[PDB]
Amino acid sequence: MVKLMIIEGEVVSGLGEGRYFLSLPPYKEIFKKILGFEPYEGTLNLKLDREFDINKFKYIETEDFEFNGKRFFGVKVLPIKILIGNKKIDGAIVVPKKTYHSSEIIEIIAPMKLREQFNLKDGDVIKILIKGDKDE
Ligand SMILES: Nc1ccn([C@@H]2O[C@H](COP(=O)(O)OP(=O)(O)O)[C@@H](O)[C@H]2O)c(=O)n1
Ligand code: NA
């Protein structure tokens, strides 16, 4: 069984967290290494209709980093396809250790600013696709 799963997500606005830590260069490096792209310095938050638990899937945990004296926690990362209209963009879900949002909100990263390049406004619904599971 090659298992897929397509989920809908309502574009929502957040605390502006992702733009920050995605700027720092060991994250850039690890994401470049893990995902094969350098993500736009931000996360697109999406509200889902039900709790999302990254542990149900085969994620990648990044290591904690020490960056010029200050330390930083790693994140779990799960590559996905972002389905916006006819297109399929490569991206990933990122789950950081601590989060102000509910467990129905996920953060998406991608090569480009998706709002801009797909004229996304809050409330728009997009789909993300997840290949395999924890047992594949
Ligand atoms: N791949 C991405 C990442 C962020 N963004 C947007 O770029 C802005 C910067 O990301 P952010 O981390 O500040 O996200 P918010 O926390 O502001 O929602 C946010 O408005 C995101 O919605 C995007 O359009 N596409
Ligand atoms: Na965000």
Curated annotation (Swiss-Prot):
Which residues does the record give as Mg(2+) binding sites? Answer: 43, 45
Binding annotation for FMN: 99-100, 107
* Ranges in coiled-coil conformation: none
Q: Name one Pfam family in it.
A: CTP-dep_RFKase
Molecular functions per Gene Ontology: magnesium ion binding; nucleotide binding; riboflavin kinase activity
The prosthetic group or cofactor this protein requires is: Mg(2+)
Per UniProt, the enzyme's principal EC class comes to transferase
**Would you say which domain of life the source belongs to?**
Archaea
- EC annotation from Swiss-Prot or TrEMBL: 2.7.1.161
Q: What is the cofactor note?
A: Binds 1 magnesium ion per subunit. This ion is coordinated by a threonine and an asparagine, and by the alpha- and beta-phosphates of CDP.
What pathway is this protein said to act in by its record?
A: Cofactor biosynthesis; FMN biosynthesis; FMN from riboflavin (CTP route): step 1/1
Query: Per the record's keyword annotation, is Nucleotide-binding included, yes or no?
Result: yes
Reactions the enzyme catalyzes: riboflavin + CTP = CDP + FMN + H(+)
Binding annotation for CDP: 14-19, 112-115
Keywords of the record: Flavoprotein, FMN, Kinase, Magnesium, Metal-binding, Nucleotide-binding, Transferase
Task: Kindly list the biological process annotations in GO that this record carries.
Answer: FMN biosynthetic process; riboflavin biosynthetic process
| Subunit field text | Monomer.
User: Which family is it part of?
Assistant: Belongs to the archaeal riboflavin kinase family.
Describe the task this protein carries out.
Catalyzes the CTP-dependent phosphorylation of riboflavin (vitamin B2) to form flavin mononucleotide (FMN). Can also utilize UTP as the phosphate donor, although less efficiently, and it is unclear if ATP and GTP can also serve as substrates or not.
Q: What is this protein called?
A: Riboflavin kinase
